[PDB]
Amino acid sequence: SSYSGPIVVDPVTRIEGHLRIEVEVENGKVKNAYSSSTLFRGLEIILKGRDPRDAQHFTQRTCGVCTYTHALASTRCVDNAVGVHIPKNATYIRNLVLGAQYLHDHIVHFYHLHALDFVDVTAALKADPAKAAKVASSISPRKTTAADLKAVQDKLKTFVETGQLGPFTNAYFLGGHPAYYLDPETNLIATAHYLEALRLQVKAARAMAVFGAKNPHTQFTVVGGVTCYDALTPQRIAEFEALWKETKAFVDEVYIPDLLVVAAAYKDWTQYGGTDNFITFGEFPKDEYDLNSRFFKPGVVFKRDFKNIKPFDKMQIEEHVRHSWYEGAEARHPWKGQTQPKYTDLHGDDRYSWMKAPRYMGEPMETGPLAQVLIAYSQGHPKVKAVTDAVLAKLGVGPEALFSTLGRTAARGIETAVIAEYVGVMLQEYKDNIAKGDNVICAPWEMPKQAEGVGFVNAPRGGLSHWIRIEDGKIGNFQLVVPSTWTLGPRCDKNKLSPVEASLIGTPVADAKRPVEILRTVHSFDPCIACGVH
Amino acid sequence: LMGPRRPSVVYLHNAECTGCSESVLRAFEPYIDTLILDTLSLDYHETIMAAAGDAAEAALEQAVNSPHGFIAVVEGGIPTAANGIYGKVANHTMLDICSRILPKAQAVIAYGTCATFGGVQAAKPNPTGAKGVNDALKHLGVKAINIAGCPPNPYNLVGTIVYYLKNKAAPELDSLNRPTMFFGQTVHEQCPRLPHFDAGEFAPSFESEEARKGWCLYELGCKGPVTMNNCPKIKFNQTNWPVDAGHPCIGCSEPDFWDAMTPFYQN
Numbered sequence A: 001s002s003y004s005g006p007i008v009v010d011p012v013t014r015i016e017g018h019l020r021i022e023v024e025v026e027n028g029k030v031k032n033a034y035s036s037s038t039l040f041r042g043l044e045i046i047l048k049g050r051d052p053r054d055a056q057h058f059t060q061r062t063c064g065v066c067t068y069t070h071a072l073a074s075t076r077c078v079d080n081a082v083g084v085h086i087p088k089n090a091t092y093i094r095n096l097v098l099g100a101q102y103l104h105d106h107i108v109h110f111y112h113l114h115a116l117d118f119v120d121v122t123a124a125l126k127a128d129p130a131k132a133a134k135v136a137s138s139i140s141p142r143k144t145t146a147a148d149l150k151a152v153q154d155k156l157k158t159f160v161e162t163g164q165l166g167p168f169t170n171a172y173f174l175g176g177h178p179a180y181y182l183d184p185e186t187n188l189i190a191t192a193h194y195l196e197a198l199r200l201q202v203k204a205a206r207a208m209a210v211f212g213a214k215n216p217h218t219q220f221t222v223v224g225g226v227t228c229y230d231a232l233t234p235q236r237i238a239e240f241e242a243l244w245k246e247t248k249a250f251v252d253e254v255y256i257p258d259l260l261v262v263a264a265a266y267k268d269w270t271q272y273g274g275t276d277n278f279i280t281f282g283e284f285p286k287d288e289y290d291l292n293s294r295f296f297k298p299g300v301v302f303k304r305d306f307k308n309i310k311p312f313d314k315m316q317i318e319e320h321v322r323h324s325w326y327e328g329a330e331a332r333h334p335w336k337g338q339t340q341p342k343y344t345d346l347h348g349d350d351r352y353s354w355m356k357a358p359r360y361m362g363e364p365m366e367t368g369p370l371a372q373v374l375i376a377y378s379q380g381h382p383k384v385k386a387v388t389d390a391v392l393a394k395l396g397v398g399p400e401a402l403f404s405t406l407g408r409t410a411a412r413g414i415e416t417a418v419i420a421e422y423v424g425v426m427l428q429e430y431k432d433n434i435a436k437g438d439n440v441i442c443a444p445w446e447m448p449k450q451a452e453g454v455g456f457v458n459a460p461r462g463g464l465s466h467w468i469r470i471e472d473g474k475i476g477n478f479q480l481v482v483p484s485t486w487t488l489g490p491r492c493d494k495n496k497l498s499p500v501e502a503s504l505i506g507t508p509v510a511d512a513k514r515p516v517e518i519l520r521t522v523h524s525f526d527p528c529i530a531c532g533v534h
Numbered sequence B: 001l002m003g004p005r006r007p008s009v010v011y012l013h014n015a016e017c018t019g020c021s022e023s024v025l026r027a028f029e030p031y032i033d034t035l036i037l038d039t040l041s042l043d044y045h046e047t048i049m050a051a052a053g054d055a056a057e058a059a060l061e062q063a064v065n066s067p068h069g070f071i072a073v074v075e076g077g078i079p080t081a082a083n084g085i086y087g088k089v090a091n092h093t094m095l096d097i098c099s100r101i102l103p104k105a106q107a108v109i110a111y112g113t114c115a116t117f118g119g120v121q122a123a124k125p126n127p128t129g130a131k132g133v134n135d136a137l138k139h140l141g142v143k144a145i146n147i148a149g150c151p152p153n154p155y156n157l158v159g160t161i162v163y164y165l166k167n168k169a170a171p172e173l174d175s176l177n178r179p180t181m182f183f184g185q186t187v188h189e190q191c192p193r194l195p196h197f198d199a200g201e202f203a204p205s206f207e208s209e210e211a212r213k214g215w216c217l218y219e220l221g222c223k224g225p226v227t228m229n230n231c232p233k234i235k236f237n238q239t240n241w242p243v244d245a246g247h248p249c250i251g252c253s254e255p256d257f258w259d260a261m262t263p264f265y266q267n
């Protein structure tokens, strides 16, 4: 029964945006892969000539999943271009909103985007809720009873019996599937928590609106700082703190135990979807002008040599277009970037994506939680090391297990747990600063006629950079280089497969009509195609 | 996907940032789980649906051709330049997708400024020829209810759907096809800083003591006076809205706002 031939997955669902994955399968395993991004908007074109202050409002609309991140990147970029050093409180507030964004984003990713690749929701109906409650209570300090889980099962039963399966229509697990491994009880636990997560994420997102006006698409950042005087008040700080505390409890008591029980069941997934090279920009600064002041530090690793972490040199980024739907074949550093669309259809002139192909010293780089976690670990980050070691010990695996689809998925949880705790540290520092009498949240600045600037964010999917050339006080060039561009962009002019493409080689496919194994790997990267293409 | 029982919703993603879908996930009383399990049957939605690829395409066909009928909710502008090729799903242009599906809907809701008016990708110079749904599909007689904002308040989507299900008709709509029950007042007339506006008490900069004191943000670009939305009344996430966070309104529920309301920090 081992399939040889093409498989196309278009649309890839349970991502942001519009992705087409093409693979060639030989004897039931992937031999080749293409990552094809099928929507272009052209925000970089639209920005030309505009007021640099307006950029963050446009670029935030790159993406509403990773909402705020692009506003933050553009504001850091214009801050940098004008040379303003924003007040300590603006750094704290900006960092706290970003921390909250990571928690919201990663919880929704695991449950609402990734878990249907691993959880058979309909098999939860077969479960013994008393058995399921015992298992749930064994993995978490949160106690769950039989009745708790029966209520979920009863709701699900009504839903399934109506014949209107809604989002579960034609799921790859319906009827059973040989690549789905969980027992009924573990499916019931995960399904219960999927549903719970639908309401918890409301609170996680609300935490961003406390200081940030609203979610999606915050409205509190300006060149020079932030606008939210109300964020200094004890009432708003208490409101934020309460939402953060409840969010953190869910991370610690529900998400991570679920992540571990699922990973333990799918331990074969340590064997697929590895990558070679990693890049990360660092995040949560003390000093807006020093990446090494960030709680996570930047770094670059080639060929998994974590004993030799290289410094990040921003001048070594170039974005390729040879296999992309843009004019020509010349890679460009983003301060000399070009966005000149030219469509040739799928594989026309060997071009197959609206994403550019960023390369660092010519190499394809994974970015995102696995890069952030592995580089921080290797830099001796104490919190990342403690959490990572505990996860590895629980799973009974060695560190080599991290270089995989499972590894990547685990690293997303690790980072969520570490960030959840660090938000409390930042919060306390913020409170302390206010208590010293520092009530300043915005600094004055002046627009230069000519300048270059760059802003760096390590976003939930990795290293984000926005690049501006100011000419006559206006946007002369504005280039976004986005984490999913790095990870899911196409081949470069050296024909090097991108991280997602390379990671798919070797993927087994049990059933070519229901290629969940491809989704597992693709989803592990948490693709954002609106981000990647803009 | 659906059969009798709950009303079927087909949710489409065109040229979008997924911020409007995220806004629906923030639904409050009712929450999104009640909406998906009890109120409606969400029969196609690329962000959260289980099926992918061919299986997702079959799910969409099954929903669209149901004899029970469906409601379409549309996120994103439709790119029309170069015969639609700037946006494709399952290798069909979004223009083609929407041209085939939306005329079959019992009702269409354009959700978010992109779907209603073209939005961010339609801002000058509009390289993909992005259009709002009713503009793009005028020739097919599509008249979507426009729920504007970037993203809109999800209260406004749910309220519109509830109304439609109860009354079997659209609520009163304004001249931009937006429900007057949500879009009938300017942001400004509802704003707590209106007494400062009337007194000509404006913050001259974000760092100023006047900004600290909560003075009016008009001199810093606030487009509240020319923007129709319910933001000050409903707020977002049950807790805040732009001007209460100290930042001007950027006009995000208005057509062409990216070009009409810019520069955002001037009036």
Ligand code: SF4
Pocket (backbone or CB within 6 Å): A061, A064, A217, B015, B016, B017, B018, B019, B020, B075, B076, B111, B112, B113, B114, B115, B119, B120, B149, B150, B151, B152
């Ligand atoms: S209206 Fe705004 S939030 Fe909604 S899809 Fe368009 S850009 Fe995104």
Ligand code: SF4
Pocket (backbone or CB within 6 Å): B187, B188, B189, B191, B192, B193, B194, B195, B197, B215, B216, B217, B218, B222, B223, B224, B225, B243, B248, B249
């Ligand atoms: S802050 Fe904006 S909406 Fe409020 S009173 Fe001033 S101009 Fe009007």
Ligand code: F3S
Pocket (backbone or CB within 6 Å): B149, B150, B187, B227, B228, B229, B231, B241, B242, B243, B248, B249, B250, B251, B252, B253
């Ligand atoms: S920017 Fe948009 S969200 Fe409301 S306050 Fe202004 S209409």
Ligand SMILES: [Mg+2]
Pocket (backbone or CB within 6 Å): A044, A356, A479, A480, A481, A482, A533, A534
């Ligand atoms: Mg770019």
